[PDB]
Scaffold this motif. Sequence first.
Motif, PDB file in Angstrom:
ATOM      1  N   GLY E   9       7.233 -11.331   6.029  1.00 16.38           N
ATOM      2  CA  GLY E   9       6.053 -12.167   6.122  1.00 16.38           C
ATOM      3  C   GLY E   9       5.107 -12.098   4.942  1.00 16.38           C
ATOM      4  N   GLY E  10       5.048 -13.177   4.168  1.00 15.00           N
ATOM      5  CA  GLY E  10       4.030 -13.320   3.150  1.00 15.00           C
ATOM      6  C   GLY E  10       4.253 -12.470   1.910  1.00 15.00           C
ATOM      7  N   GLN E  11       3.157 -12.295   1.164  1.00 16.61           N
ATOM      8  CA  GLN E  11       3.201 -11.570  -0.104  1.00 16.61           C
ATOM      9  C   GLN E  11       3.507 -10.095   0.108  1.00 16.61           C
ATOM     10  N   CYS E  12       2.802  -9.455   1.043  1.00 14.15           N
ATOM     11  CA  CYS E  12       3.048  -8.043   1.307  1.00 14.15           C
ATOM     12  C   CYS E  12       4.409  -7.833   1.955  1.00 14.15           C
ATOM     13  N   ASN E  14       7.184  -9.644   1.686  1.00 10.13           N
ATOM     14  CA  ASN E  14       8.309  -9.865   0.784  1.00 10.13           C
ATOM     15  C   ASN E  14       8.516  -8.678  -0.148  1.00 10.13           C
ATOM     16  N   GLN E  15       7.430  -8.100  -0.659  1.00  6.01           N
ATOM     17  CA  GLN E  15       7.557  -6.949  -1.546  1.00  6.01           C
ATOM     18  C   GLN E  15       7.919  -5.684  -0.779  1.00  6.01           C
ATOM     19  N   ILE E  16       7.393  -5.524   0.440  1.00  3.99           N
ATOM     20  CA  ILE E  16       7.708  -4.346   1.239  1.00  3.99           C
ATOM     21  C   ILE E  16       9.145  -4.384   1.740  1.00  3.99           C
ATOM     22  N   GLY E 141      -4.081 -10.992   4.858  1.00  6.81           N
ATOM     23  CA  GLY E 141      -3.873 -12.291   4.257  1.00  6.81           C
ATOM     24  C   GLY E 141      -3.848 -13.396   5.291  1.00  6.81           C
ATOM     25  N   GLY E 142      -3.284 -14.530   4.890  1.00  9.46           N
ATOM     26  CA  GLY E 142      -3.100 -15.632   5.812  1.00  9.46           C
ATOM     27  C   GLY E 142      -1.678 -16.148   5.832  1.00  9.46           C
ATOM     28  N   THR E 143      -0.923 -15.856   4.773  1.00 11.74           N
ATOM     29  CA  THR E 143       0.462 -16.309   4.702  1.00 11.74           C
ATOM     30  C   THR E 143       1.339 -15.528   5.669  1.00 11.74           C
ATOM     31  N   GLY E 144       1.195 -14.208   5.684  1.00 15.49           N
ATOM     32  CA  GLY E 144       2.003 -13.376   6.550  1.00 15.49           C
ATOM     33  C   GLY E 144       1.297 -12.984   7.829  1.00 15.49           C
ATOM     34  N   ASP E 203      -1.645   1.101   6.491  1.00 16.96           N
ATOM     35  CA  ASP E 203      -2.861   0.714   5.788  1.00 16.96           C
ATOM     36  C   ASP E 203      -2.755   1.166   4.341  1.00 16.96           C
ATOM     37  N   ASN E 204      -3.394   0.415   3.449  1.00 21.55           N
ATOM     38  CA  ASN E 204      -3.279   0.730   2.031  1.00 21.55           C
ATOM     39  C   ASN E 204      -4.126   1.936   1.645  1.00 21.55           C
ATOM     40  N   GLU E 205      -5.277   2.121   2.295  1.00 14.15           N
ATOM     41  CA  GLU E 205      -6.202   3.176   1.890  1.00 14.15           C
ATOM     42  C   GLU E 205      -5.682   4.572   2.207  1.00 14.15           C
ATOM     43  N   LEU E 225       3.781   2.929  -3.307  1.00 12.38           N
ATOM     44  CA  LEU E 225       3.305   2.746  -1.940  1.00 12.38           C
ATOM     45  C   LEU E 225       4.304   1.956  -1.109  1.00 12.38           C
ATOM     46  N   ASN E 226       4.963   0.968  -1.716  1.00 16.85           N
ATOM     47  CA  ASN E 226       5.946   0.189  -0.975  1.00 16.85           C
ATOM     48  C   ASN E 226       7.168   1.018  -0.638  1.00 16.85           C
ATOM     49  N   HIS E 227       7.496   1.987  -1.484  1.00 22.94           N
ATOM     50  CA  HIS E 227       8.663   2.810  -1.228  1.00 22.94           C
ATOM     51  C   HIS E 227       8.401   3.847  -0.144  1.00 22.94           C
TER      52      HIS E 227
HETATM   53  N1  LIG Z   1       1.564  -1.774   0.227  1.00 24.04           N
HETATM   54  C1  LIG Z   1       1.482  -3.013  -0.313  1.00 24.04           C
HETATM   55  N2  LIG Z   1       0.423  -3.790   0.007  1.00 24.04           N
HETATM   56  C2  LIG Z   1       0.302  -5.031  -0.509  1.00 24.04           C
HETATM   57  C3  LIG Z   1       1.330  -5.535  -1.421  1.00 24.04           C
HETATM   58  N3  LIG Z   1       0.957  -6.776  -1.774  1.00 24.04           N
HETATM   59  C4  LIG Z   1      -0.211  -7.046  -1.138  1.00 24.04           C
HETATM   60  N4  LIG Z   1      -0.596  -6.000  -0.388  1.00 24.04           N
HETATM   61  C5  LIG Z   1      -1.808  -5.906   0.452  1.00 24.04           C
HETATM   62  O1  LIG Z   1      -2.022  -7.121   1.163  1.00 24.04           O
HETATM   63  C6  LIG Z   1      -3.419  -7.369   1.278  1.00 24.04           C
HETATM   64  C7  LIG Z   1      -3.646  -8.848   1.055  1.00 24.04           C
HETATM   65  O2  LIG Z   1      -2.512  -9.528   1.572  1.00 24.04           O
HETATM   66  P1  LIG Z   1      -2.013 -10.877   0.866  1.00 24.04           P
HETATM   67  O3  LIG Z   1      -1.362 -10.568  -0.460  1.00 24.04           O
HETATM   68  O4  LIG Z   1      -3.150 -11.854   0.695  1.00 24.04           O
HETATM   69  O5  LIG Z   1      -0.927 -11.446   1.894  1.00 24.04           O
HETATM   70  P2  LIG Z   1      -0.489 -12.979   1.759  1.00 24.04           P
HETATM   71  O6  LIG Z   1      -1.323 -13.820   2.692  1.00 24.04           O
HETATM   72  O7  LIG Z   1       0.965 -13.094   2.127  1.00 24.04           O
HETATM   73  O8  LIG Z   1      -0.701 -13.443   0.340  1.00 24.04           O
HETATM   74  C8  LIG Z   1      -4.098  -6.557   0.192  1.00 24.04           C
HETATM   75  O9  LIG Z   1      -5.127  -5.741   0.759  1.00 24.04           O
HETATM   76  C9  LIG Z   1      -3.026  -5.687  -0.423  1.00 24.04           C
HETATM   77  O10 LIG Z   1      -3.421  -4.313  -0.387  1.00 24.04           O
HETATM   78  C10 LIG Z   1       2.455  -4.627  -1.723  1.00 24.04           C
HETATM   79  O11 LIG Z   1       3.377  -4.974  -2.491  1.00 24.04           O
HETATM   80  N5  LIG Z   1       2.453  -3.423  -1.145  1.00 24.04           N
END
Ligand SMILES: Nc1nc2c(ncn2[C@@H]2O[C@H](COP(=O)(O)OP(=O)(O)O)[C@@H](O)[C@H]2O)c(=O)[nH]1
Lengths: 430, 429, 50, 154, 427, 427
Positions: E9-12, E14-16, E141-144, E203-205, E225-227
């Motif tokens: 789902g979304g940017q996070c 796809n990379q995760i 986000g809103g995409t995922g 959570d990222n923090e 962090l993704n790994h």
């Molecule tokens: N752990 C991790 N977090 C991510 C990554 N990419 C985005 N994020 C987190 O996702 C949050 C925002 O999400 P977003 O990128 O807007 O999701 P989108 O709606 O799909 O674009 C941010 O607070 C980032 O910390 C990633 O590759 N790894």
Amino acid sequence: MREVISIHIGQAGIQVGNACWELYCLEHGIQPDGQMPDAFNTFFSETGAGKHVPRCIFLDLEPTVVDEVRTGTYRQLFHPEQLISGKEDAANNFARGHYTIGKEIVDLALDRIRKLADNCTGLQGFLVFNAVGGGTGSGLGSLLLERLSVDYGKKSKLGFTVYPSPQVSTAVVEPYNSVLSTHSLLEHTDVAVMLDNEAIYDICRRSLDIERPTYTNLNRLIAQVISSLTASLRFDGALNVDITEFQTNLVPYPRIHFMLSSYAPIISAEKAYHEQLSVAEITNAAFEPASMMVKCDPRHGKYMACCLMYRGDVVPKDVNASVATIKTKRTIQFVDWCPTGFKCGINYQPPTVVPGGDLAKVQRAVCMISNSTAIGEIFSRLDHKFDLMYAKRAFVHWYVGEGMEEGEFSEAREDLAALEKDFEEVGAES
Amino acid sequence: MREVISIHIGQAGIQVGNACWELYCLEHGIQPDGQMPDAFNTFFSETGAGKHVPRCIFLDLEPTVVDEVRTGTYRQLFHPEQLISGKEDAANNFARGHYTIGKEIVDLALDRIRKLADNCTGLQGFLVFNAVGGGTGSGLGSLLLERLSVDYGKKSKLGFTVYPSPQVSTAVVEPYNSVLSTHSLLEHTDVAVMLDNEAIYDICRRSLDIERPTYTNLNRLIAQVISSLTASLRFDGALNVDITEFQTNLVPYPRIHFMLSSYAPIISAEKAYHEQLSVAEITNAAFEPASMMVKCDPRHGKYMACCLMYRGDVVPKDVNASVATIKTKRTIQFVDWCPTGFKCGINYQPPTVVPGGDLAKVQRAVCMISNSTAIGEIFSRLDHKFDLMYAKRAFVHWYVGEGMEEGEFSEAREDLAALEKDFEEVGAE
Amino acid sequence: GNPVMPARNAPAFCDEYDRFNRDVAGEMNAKKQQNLQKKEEVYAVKRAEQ
Amino acid sequence: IVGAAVMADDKHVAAASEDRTWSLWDVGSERVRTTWRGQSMFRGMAVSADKVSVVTVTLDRKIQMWDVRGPDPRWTKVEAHGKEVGCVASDHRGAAFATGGADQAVRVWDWRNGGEVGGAACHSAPVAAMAFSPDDAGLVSVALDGSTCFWQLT
Amino acid sequence: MREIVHIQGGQCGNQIGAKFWEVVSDEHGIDPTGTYHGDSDLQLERINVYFNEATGGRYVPRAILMDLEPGTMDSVRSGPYGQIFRPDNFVFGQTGAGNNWAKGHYTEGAELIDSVLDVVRKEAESCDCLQGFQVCHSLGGGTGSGMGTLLISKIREEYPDRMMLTFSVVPSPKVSDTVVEPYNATLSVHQLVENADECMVLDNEALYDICFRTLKLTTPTFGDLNHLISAVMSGITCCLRFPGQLNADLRKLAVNLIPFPRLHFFMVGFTPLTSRGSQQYRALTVPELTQQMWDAKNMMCAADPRHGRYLTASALFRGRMSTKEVDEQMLNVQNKNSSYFVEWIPNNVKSSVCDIPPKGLKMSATFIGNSTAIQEMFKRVSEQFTAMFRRKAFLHWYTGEGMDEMEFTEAESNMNDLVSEYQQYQD
Amino acid sequence: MREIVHIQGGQCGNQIGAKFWEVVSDEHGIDPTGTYHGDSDLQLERINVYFNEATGGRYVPRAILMDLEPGTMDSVRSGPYGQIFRPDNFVFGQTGAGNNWAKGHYTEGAELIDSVLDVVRKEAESCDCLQGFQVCHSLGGGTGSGMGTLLISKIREEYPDRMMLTFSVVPSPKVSDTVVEPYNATLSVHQLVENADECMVLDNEALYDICFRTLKLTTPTFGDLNHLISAVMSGITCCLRFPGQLNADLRKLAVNLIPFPRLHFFMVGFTPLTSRGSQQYRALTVPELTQQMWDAKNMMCAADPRHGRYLTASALFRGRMSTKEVDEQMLNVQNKNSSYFVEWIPNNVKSSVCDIPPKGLKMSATFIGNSTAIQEMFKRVSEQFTAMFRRKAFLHWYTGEGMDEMEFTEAESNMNDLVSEYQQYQD
Ligand SMILES: Nc1nc2c(ncn2[C@@H]2O[C@H](COP(=O)(O)OP(=O)(O)O)[C@@H](O)[C@H]2O)c(=O)[nH]1
Ligand SMILES: Nc1nc2c(ncn2[C@@H]2O[C@H](COP(=O)(O)OP(=O)(O)OP(=O)(O)O)[C@@H](O)[C@H]2O)c(=O)[nH]1
Ligand SMILES: Nc1nc2c(ncn2[C@@H]2O[C@H](COP(=O)(O)OP(=O)(O)OP(=O)(O)O)[C@@H](O)[C@H]2O)c(=O)[nH]1
Ligand SMILES: Nc1nc2c(ncn2[C@@H]2O[C@H](COP(=O)(O)OP(=O)(O)O)[C@@H](O)[C@H]2O)c(=O)[nH]1
Ligand SMILES: [Mg+2]
């Protein structure tokens, strides 16, 4: 001709059954391929020419424990239809093992039992291996024992069940599945032998000097107890004892059929050089509370009936002297309405040691299977753990949505509550 | 298994710690890289295969001595997060090391202690190393010792504190930091062994003929004292003495836990050939006041109890024959409530010689740690220096402004005053 | 590099052959026998020294 | 099944498959004598002169020489860690042993102890076959592509 | 034969999953091209859990990568290990969510969910005995978030009897990437409590704090962090792919963790984390995996587990270890601090042993915790949302997509009921 | 057939026991391996008194070795004849007493006293008929004194009709190994009076007198003192293991040496202690044994027999001897100095003649003597105890383990009860 059928339910039963048939092949000299380079009749069926197939069914809903047998060193031994698998596991749910996903596999299990019962001429009993703490072991074990009672009346069924320990356990809904399993193993299982993991860990750490025990080192000595139980079925002896003969001595009443087990000469290889294993010496160590296979202190209760299984160089005189000294011992106690208490069995075969194992090569052994009133505190502790979880209605929504009603827990605890009071009522003096 | 956890606090703690762990790598054959090419279990913990790591933490608020360990000859010996460093030093201030900056770094200290306690099976004691003349040793050493009483109850703690000298010392606020430390280590340290820098200066000039000694020369023979008193656990001997044995045979009363120290053979290479180092001579040399590790005169007081730890080729007859002569001498005086006053521990391992050091290879050695009523003159002399300090309130705004209340100056003042009365009443016949 | 993956010289690392072996009881039995033999050797050396 | 070979007598066969197993069977009574198991799937077998060794090369880049009695691998060697190890065959005199890998290499070992004698690399593709001439003059070792390699034994 | 259908789902997400599918492919010995270069037969026995057999020995994942902006799809495809994924599974939009939860859920989510649900149906019907759908996505986000949680909605009425292992990263108190994080998080939790089966909260923090403290890596990227999350997403389904002394699949874990149907948010952690300076000095033993398992700083949620009692817990041990050491260490953590454990459940801790460790490790473990401490991170997001909503801030961007302000009031309702029901089991 | 169960406590008891089992197995012909290598048939006739026959013909000693310091049982495995012992009987602690009577007797010794009684019950029931329990330990220590006297209290209560032999070494007059000896010594002898059937006092600085003046050993090894102790303990059990003209077991010695129940504290000495320089000049004859036996410097207690009158005595003669000429030496020693012998006991000396001499020695003898002069080394310990306890010094390490100051006044008064009743027979 005498035969038994050993059924194994769930993850615990197969791993016990993997260790059991490993030792049964060594006793009769059968290689894992199934070919031997009349003592083998009770366990193995001589098929065609030179092929020995075990008399067992390995049913489990989770494939992962069964395909290990299908792939490992004993894949050629077992008939392919004898190992029964399913798609998805019961997942610590008695309702799933009994109602939803256990009904499509219980019908196929009886088909394999019927064809195994048709092969054997004189069927002597059933050996069931299961764990009441899990879903497949308790739930599907309940359904198989219920069907075997209706389908095969009067036939012996021997419950070698694994039970939750007081302090050590590995699942959260073990109190739920075990209480529901006790509602089934009363009315169906003829003689049930309790097994507890933590008591074996006490044995494995102390008697064998194994600082890190595991389930494999656990099961190798559990396989010795069931092998010692069936020793007179396969080898000669001075005082032969049969499966239907344990029932005539170890259960004084129909609702008291829980047995504590013990194995005497559990000595490692390095300790065996110095220790002299006499018949009187191992008999004393067989009655030790530390050497019990269940976490109980049998000093708490009174012994109703005891049975002894001697293997190897045991003359029938020193067994009679050993039971005389253990009768007069004050720290042990027998109930007043059973003046004689002992059943003695002697088998001429010395115990066999598995290669790469832990137990030393010994000349003598005792297997004590005993009925005591100290088994009441097994059920009292589980009743406290069930009532403490059922009061606030924990994990009930998993059981309710998978076939059960809410009040089935009330029936099972009330059934176990009667099982609590009759142990004290019988053990009380008159 | 027998094990200790040696915690080192302050600049003196790390520098003695860097010197003693060099000595401990020599008895067991541990290389500086950390690979040996069951006696090592009390100091070096076997991790994985081939690696032995020390059972120590190096906590100091000033990062200029910790990184010297991190870049010196023992980079690969130490587990890197055992060495705890801080942003800035306590700056000769007990109040800073106890209240201001010592509060954040003590949490990491108990975290690493918790790892070391769970890793080893059987503890036997905590060894502390600190200098109460400095801010980190007084302050952070106090707060660490407060925590070890409430986490690990009834466990033995061993005190080895560098104590301020009467004559020559390197600090100006050294009366303040010393008084406030003794208020906290009275009810916390089960054994306290004082060490005085001018007493070890006097040992190096006479016994070792080093006319210009430094701190590196002083820390080496201090390390021999700590190694001898733990040598019984490491190596088998005729009369094993334990860490828990030290408390039961030296302190008669729970508030009297201050003991002197003396290492008997202190001989250079050239003087070793002409001296017949017999057991009677070194035992006589241990009780001589100029061989004591504290600038004190035990002839003034009277010994309450004594301990003797023997290394090397010592048979048990002539240790009994040597202490027979000692009890007959009238210069040494014993309290009338302790007729038998010695504990003798004999090991079979001769002391190891450090490369480049000044102590020569010897066969027999003694480490005498003894409780005495002459120790009360050490605290009474520093009683006078603190009273001259606090009379007109010098260097107090560095303390009051940095957290602590000025009422704790008098509370620690009255506590050491009661300790002065306590030493003078136990020595009365 | 890789965070959770060790660096070829750590106690945590396994070879690809080593990470797929499954004989826990067998390996612990072998370690127990080797430890007992080493303890016998240590006792013999201490006896010779005494 | 990957490798197979007759014994010194015509009455016994030997085989080695991808089920991590190899075996020696009787032609007359068509049943197993004994079964040897391994920890990785095999990729080739060969039988030395008069029963002394049966050698199998696996997927996990190792050569395991076996004695028929005493079921334990007599000698295992990890080798050619670049790519996979493909095929083997035996000298008839029992003094030499060929080895081929998915590398560009062919190797010559000895049955008593592994000592490298053969050359570095000639063929292009990974190997597929072996089997020295019956006088130890040479060896036709062939690659996976349309390449054959003729070798003279030093 | 229990398979898992992965949803990205979304940017996070796809990379995760770009790094998650890299881990399990190297764990199963699959090369970047897709052929089997694995070295032993335990890998081949369970490939059906994650991959598909294809012509020529190829192994392609059951991964359905979906988003609204094609830029993230170009990064994962052109990068390493990007050829394993099926090209037709790369469904994507063109407009983009633009951080708008309403846009990802209502306007442009409508014409893409019907496309991605066909890929779900094609993947789910082809395989034989489904275990559940695993989804990795974001709540910030809103995409995922909007589109990801609506995929969870429409898949739930169609397959109600199967599991749902959702992974969700949440907005942070310390550092905020976007402005509408409180709005997107609270509207996604409302769709997550009713639909998802079990939820793993990331959570990222916490991941920055873990990498800074434990790993001593002073400047983490999105790579390391993704790994870490990839090292834990492998650990949950470890017993499915490999045999063990005591196996535990997803439905083993759900029954032993949630006592009540709505308490299905967890906290996760990975045991053998160590810095490169500390690798040579640390020994892998069950006593020290266990102490790093229960450490508060090792956990991967912002909620400190010391504040809240552990209602239930589970352990996913991997490697060759004795079950007594698994049993005794988890018993020891119950008695030394029994004040941290809930009293009306005895033996809170589930344990299970998998006989195969991860790549290049002797032993490893994965912790799942159902603690009542996680009410403080839902509460903290809630007070972020209430502060914005009382002033009607950033709501005109949300009411323009047909989403009225009435649903915001009820979205906070069960948001506050989640933290109310977690609080009353703590007392 | 009259079995003796040996039990050892602490560092001293294991070191005494290691030399004891070397000497006895040498004269029985038992190698350190466990087999039998003797040259005479008399050794195998009575061997079950000290060694249990095992499988394969190995003989395992009937010894129970205990200590709270686990490293000390590594020293008895490291010692010669250290592999003959059964590993099961090696009951071990972890903490260590550290010269504390209270730690060994109440706090730390109680967790180990269940397993020591477990193996004592197992060992006693294995043999046919017990003849007694033999213990060698310390009184100045913490394990041999604290854990020892608790064991002696326990096995006297359980087995009341069986004899008790305590070869307890007592704190020294001149030089002491540890400061807290009178605290441990007085508390040990309080428990010894009402429990031990007979006690045999040894002192280390009486043993040093033997090694210096008589043996001419310039530097006596600490194990040479145990050689003298092992020579005596082998001599007490002489008539059981070997045939003789006049036999006397441990019970016949008790009924002759003990006129009144509380006076069961003896002092002993082995007779033919000669140097190697003076070995050739002394005629090994019976009169040379007798007068050297009664000499004050031979006796292994600090109490001098010349100060107080002998109450009873026992002689144990081994080798080729004449019964008349042995007996006439005993009548002669009672008449030439009749002031040192009590008047209301005629024939104060008992004698037994054993026919099998010790290996390599033609003729030997062992003395046991109950004297009223043994109060000199109990009043001395009471002098040490009254000094320390009056100022309540070194007491917080005893009162912290549960016992109060009233238990000190129990042992102080009972010590003064024994020296009162000994003194009134000296008059
Ligand atoms: N752990 C991790 N977090 C991510 C990554 N990419 C985005 N994020 C987190 O996702 C949050 C925002 O999400 P977003 O990128 O807007 O999701 P989108 O709606 O799909 O674009 C941010 O607070 C980032 O910390 C990633 O590759 N790894
Ligand atoms: N004695 C013994 N008990 C075991 C062994 N393995 C597992 N158990 C017991 O089995 C329990 C786990 O439940 P199981 O019934 O085995 O689980 P299962 O058989 O897979 O049933 P489902 O989980 O519902 O599929 C544990 O609590 C253990 O007590 C074993 O090897 N020996
Ligand atoms: N014997 C000995 N004493 C030392 C050594 N290093 C420092 N000292 C003593 O320590 C005193 C200085 O105070 P410290 O405690 O070391 O100061 P610190 O540890 O840096 O603490 P802060 O000053 O607050 O940072 C000196 O007067 C010395 O007596 C050493 O290596 N050997
Ligand atoms: N004769 C003799 N005395 C010993 C021996 N070992 C220790 N001792 C004495 O025993 C006393 C100390 O007893 P100890 O071993 O510490 O007892 P524990 O601490 O209670 O176990 C000292 O006075 C020693 O002189 C020995 O082997 N022989
Ligand atoms: Mg299961």
